[PDB]
Amino acid sequence: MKTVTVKNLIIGEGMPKIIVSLMGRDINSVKAEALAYREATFDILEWRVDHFMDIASTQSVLTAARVIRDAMPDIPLLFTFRSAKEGGEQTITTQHYLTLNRAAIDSGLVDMIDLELFTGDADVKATVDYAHAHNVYVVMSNHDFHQTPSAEEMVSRLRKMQALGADIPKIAVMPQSKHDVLTLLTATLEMQQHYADRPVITMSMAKEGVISRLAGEVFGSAATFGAVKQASAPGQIAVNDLRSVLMILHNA
Amino acid sequence: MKTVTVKNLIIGEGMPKIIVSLMGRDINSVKAEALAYREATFDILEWRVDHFMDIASTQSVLTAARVIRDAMPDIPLLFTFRSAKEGGEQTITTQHYLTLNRAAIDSGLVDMIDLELFTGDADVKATVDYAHAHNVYVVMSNHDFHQTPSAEEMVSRLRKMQALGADIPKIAVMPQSKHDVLTLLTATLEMQQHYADRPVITMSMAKEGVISRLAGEVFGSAATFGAVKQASAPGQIAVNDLRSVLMILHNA
Numbered sequence: 001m002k003t004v005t006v007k008n009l010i011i012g013e014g015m016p017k018i019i020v021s022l023m024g025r026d027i028n029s030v031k032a033e034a035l036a037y038r039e040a041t042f043d044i045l046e047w048r049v050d051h052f053m054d055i056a057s058t059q060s061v062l063t064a065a066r067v068i069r070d071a072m073p074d075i076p077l078l079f080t081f082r083s084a085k086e087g088g089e090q091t092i093t094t095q096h097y098l099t100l101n102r103a104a105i106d107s108g109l110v111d112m113i114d115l116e117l118f119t120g121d122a123d124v125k126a127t128v129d130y131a132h133a134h135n136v137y138v139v140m141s142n143h144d145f146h147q148t149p150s151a152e153e154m155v156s157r158l159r160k161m162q163a164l165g166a167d168i169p170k171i172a173v174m175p176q177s178k179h180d181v182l183t184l185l186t187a188t189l190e191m192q193q194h195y196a197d198r199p200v201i202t203m204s205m206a207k208e209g210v211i212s213r214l215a216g217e218v219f220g221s222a223a224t225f226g227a228v229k230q231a232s233a234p235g236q237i238a239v240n241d242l243r244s245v246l247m248i249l250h251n252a
Numbered sequence: 253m254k255t256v257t258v259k260n261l262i263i264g265e266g267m268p269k270i271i272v273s274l275m276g277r278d279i280n281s282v283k284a285e286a287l288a289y290r291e292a293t294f295d296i297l298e299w300r301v302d303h304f305m306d307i308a309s310t311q312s313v314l315t316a317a318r319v320i321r322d323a324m325p326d327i328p329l330l331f332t333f334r335s336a337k338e339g340g341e342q343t344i345t346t347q348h349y350l351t352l353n354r355a356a357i358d359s360g361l362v363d364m365i366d367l368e369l370f371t372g373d374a375d376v377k378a379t380v381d382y383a384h385a386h387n388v389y390v391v392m393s394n395h396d397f398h399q400t401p402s403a404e405e406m407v408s409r410l411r412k413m414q415a416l417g418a419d420i421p422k423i424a425v426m427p428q429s430k431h432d433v434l435t436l437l438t439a440t441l442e443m444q445q446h447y448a449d450r451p452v453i454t455m456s457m458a459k460e461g462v463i464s465r466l467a468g469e470v471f472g473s474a475a476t477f478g479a480v481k482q483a484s485a486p487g488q489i490a491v492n493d494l495r496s497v498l499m500i501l502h503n504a
């Protein structure tokens with residue numbers, strides 16, 4: 001397949017990269033969280049913009065993004081507004097969603113953005129090219145917080161994200177049973193073996209799906225989420241614990 | 253299901269139990285290895301009898317068991333002669349193998365024995381009843397060191413083991429691809445939810461199957477093998493490492 005480099009990282013080769021999500025409600029919050037995250041060990045920092053209360057102000061959004069970037073200038077920064085329909089904290093209009101991501105891209109403060117696939121083909125396609133024209137990489141994502149779609153459905157979604165120009169396709173689903181966890185792992189291998197040409201990230205949420213956060217080096221997920229102090233989705237475990245398990249699997 | 257209690261250990265409840273195999277050629281290495289292992293942390297000791305070069309003498313076999321039994325009197329002791337067609341070091345006749353397992357049971361030195369399913373139905377059943385009349389538990393086992401059979405075949409072998417009175421049906425298979433590792437996990441979980449009424453032990457060997465050694469609390473395998481200095485089959489990892497991973501999954 002292919003690899004993606006941001007800063008001094010290569011995504012899609014080696015051990016799965018560790019992503020942690022920073023969440024703060026207002027500026028002073030972001031600023032405290034940015035100082036404490038500096039002392040943890042992770043590959044990529046994701047800022048969960050949907051927990052921020054000042055999202056109608058571009059000024060506030062970029063001031064929070066600059067406090068983060070200052071604190072951690074050499075870590076790849078992933079800007080993610082996670083909409084309420086896919087598990088996030090807040091609902092915005094589609095226009096407001098696209099204006100926040102463009103602002104992020106033009107600012108120069110962010111290395112990647114997340115774009116939700118079901119936002120609408122034409123809107124996602126136009127933002128992907130705008131991003132690529134500024135050398136911002138696109139993580140395209142999809143989430144099912146109530147169920148696990150069949151393997152077939154999941155591979156099509158992932159392929160749909162590749163057709164639309166995502167640099168890194170991503171899917172997260174909620175298991176209703178232990179077999180749902182094996183369906184996610186099978187769709188991941190299937191994509192990675194027959195269709196992928198770039199790095200792919202996949203995960204099964206909650207307690208049953210934790211194995212899916214630990215086995216991406218076997219089944220083909222390029223990155224995984226850990227928690228520094230709080231979890232941004234059901235199932236993440238502490239980043240030091242997460243990192244021990246990855247190295248054990250990697251050096252086995 | 254139902255569980256197996258041996259010494260103070262409940263097999264088939266909680267976090268998977270850890271088994272290490274002790275391998276020594278004669279009585280003084282058996283003794284040395286037993287002293288060394290006495291410093292590691294594990295639940296069940298497996299003595300692999302097929303590495304002992306003096307199996308022609310029953311008395312030398314029972315002296316080696318007593319030496320082990322003496323250094324570690326409070327751990328469950330599983331007596332396993334692995335035959336050469338199922339991955340082991342030496343060939344013995346069927347007759348001699350059933351005689352040796354009967355001498356182990358009679359000796360009062362072992363808590364459990366391993367019986368290979370494919371020894372033959374009638375012989376294996378009679379040996380099961382005899383062990384049970386002495387309160388000796390039976391791990392019935394089946395190995396494919398060349399490939400992974402279908403999920404269906406595997407479920408069928410495990411169910412036939414229960415049908416023969418095994419206390420703990422066991423299977424180990426060799427993955428030829430990453431899909432094979434998933435087929436092993438799918439068999440384990442289908443057995444655990446639909447047919448098992450007792451604990452089962454399953455593993456996918458080698459470096460590709462390592463994940464199967466760590467995810468037994470999710471997919472339904474009650475025990476897993478680790479290595480104290482050397483591995484007793486392809487893919488086992490260091491018991492302290494193995495145990496760190498089981499803990500994180502346990503408290504995930």
Ligand SMILES: *[C@H]1C=C(C(=O)[O-])C[C@H](O)[C@H]1O
Nearest residue numbers: 021080172205225232233
């Ligand atoms: C989607 C990834 C999530 C998780 O691992 O399940 C939460 C994260 O913050 C989202 O970006």
Ligand SMILES: *[C@H]1C=C(C(=O)[O-])C[C@H](O)[C@H]1O
Nearest residue numbers: 273332424455477484485
């Ligand atoms: C059968 C279990 C094998 C496994 O660990 O892969 C090895 C072991 O010693 C045999 O007992």
